[PDB]
Swiss-Prot record:
Domain C2, chain residue ranges per copy: 3-136
Residues binding Ca(2+) 4, per UniProt: D34, D40, D94, D96
Subunit comment: Homotetramer. Heterodimer; heterodimerizes with SYT2 in presence of calcium. Interacts with SCAMP5. Interacts with STON2. Forms a complex with SV2B, syntaxin 1 and SNAP25. Interacts with SV2A, SV2B and SV2C. Interacts with RIMS1. Interacts with PRRT2. Interacts with DNAJC5 in a phosphorylation-dependent manner. Interacts (via N-terminus) with RAB3A. Interacts with SYT12. Interacts with calmodulin. Interacts with DNM1 (via C-terminal proline-rich domain (PRD)); this interaction facilitates vesicle fission during clathrin-mediated endocytosis (CME).
Residues recorded with modification Phosphoserine: S73, S75
Protein's job: Calcium sensor that participates in triggering neurotransmitter release at the synapse. May have a regulatory role in the membrane interactions during trafficking of synaptic vesicles at the active zone of the synapse. It binds acidic phospholipids with a specificity that requires the presence of both an acidic head group and a diacyl backbone. A Ca(2+)-dependent interaction between synaptotagmin and putative receptors for activated protein kinase C has also been reported. It can bind to at least three additional proteins in a Ca(2+)-independent manner; these are neurexins, syntaxin and AP2. (Microbial infection) Receptor for C.botulinum neurotoxin type B (BoNT/B, botB); interaction is improved in the presence of gangliosides. BoNT/B toxin binds to the membrane proximal vesicular domain of Syt1 (residues 32-51).
Tissue and organ expression note: Expressed in the brain (at protein level). Predominantly expressed in rostral, phylogenetically younger brain regions, and in some endocrine tissues.
Signal peptide: none
Protein name: Synaptotagmin-1
Gene: Syt1
Annotated family: Belongs to the synaptotagmin family.
Organism: Rattus norvegicus
Record remark: domains: The first C2 domain mediates Ca(2+)-dependent phospholipid binding. The second C2 domain mediates interaction with SV2A and probably with STN2.
Phenotype when changing M33K: Fails to localize at nerve terminals
Compartment(s): Cytoplasmic vesicle, Secretory vesicle membrane; Cytoplasmic vesicle, Secretory vesicle, Synaptic vesicle membrane; Cytoplasmic vesicle, Secretory vesicle, Chromaffin granule membrane; Cytoplasm
Length: 149
């Protein structure tokens, strides 16, 4: 009920290759982050383990929209012996030309995930090589970061 918006992405894991693929599909219902009434959203993806940010990716920026479509794919190298102990963090931010780009909200999937986040990750693991798309509710960074730290 924090009213930040939602993000849709797919997950795919290939155990033999250790290839983890995340496709950022779209976000909707995003919080307004600029005085014009809109936002300029882009998405960051972090691969994490044990409180440490290991790798990062980011999408292009969409201007002046609360319902951006991306369709941008990213891949990480995670060995099968480690895939159950990592997190994938997905953050939507508002781009501002000057000043800190503030997060709208974020979610993570993987180790220590719960609810729909755990469901998505478990679905990915249960179906090697198969891409699984799912919606997630964005959550305030204060709360998500406390779980990741
Ligand atoms: Ca702003
Ligand atoms: Ca703008
Ligand atoms: Ca902006």
């Amino acid at each position: 009920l924090e009213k930040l918006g939602d993000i849709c992405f797919s997950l795919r894991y290939v155990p033999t290759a250790g290839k983890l693929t995340v496709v950022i599909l779209e976000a909707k219902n995003l919080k307004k982050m600029d005085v014009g009434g809109l936002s300029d959203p882009y998405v960051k993806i972090h691969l994490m383990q044990n409180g440490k940010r290991l790798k990062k990716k980011k999408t292009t920026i969409k201007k002046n929209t609360l319902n951006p479509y991306y369709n941008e794919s990213f891949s990480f190298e995670v060995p099968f012996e480690q895939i159950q102990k990592v997190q994938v963090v997905v953050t939507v931010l508002d781009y501002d030309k000057i000043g800190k780009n503030d997060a709208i909200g974020k979610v993570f999937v993987g180790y220590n995930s719960t609810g729909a986040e755990l469901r998505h990750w478990s679905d990915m693991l249960a179906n090697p090589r198969r891409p699984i798309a799912q919606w997630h509710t964005l959550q305030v960074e204060e709360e998500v970061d406390a779980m990741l730290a």
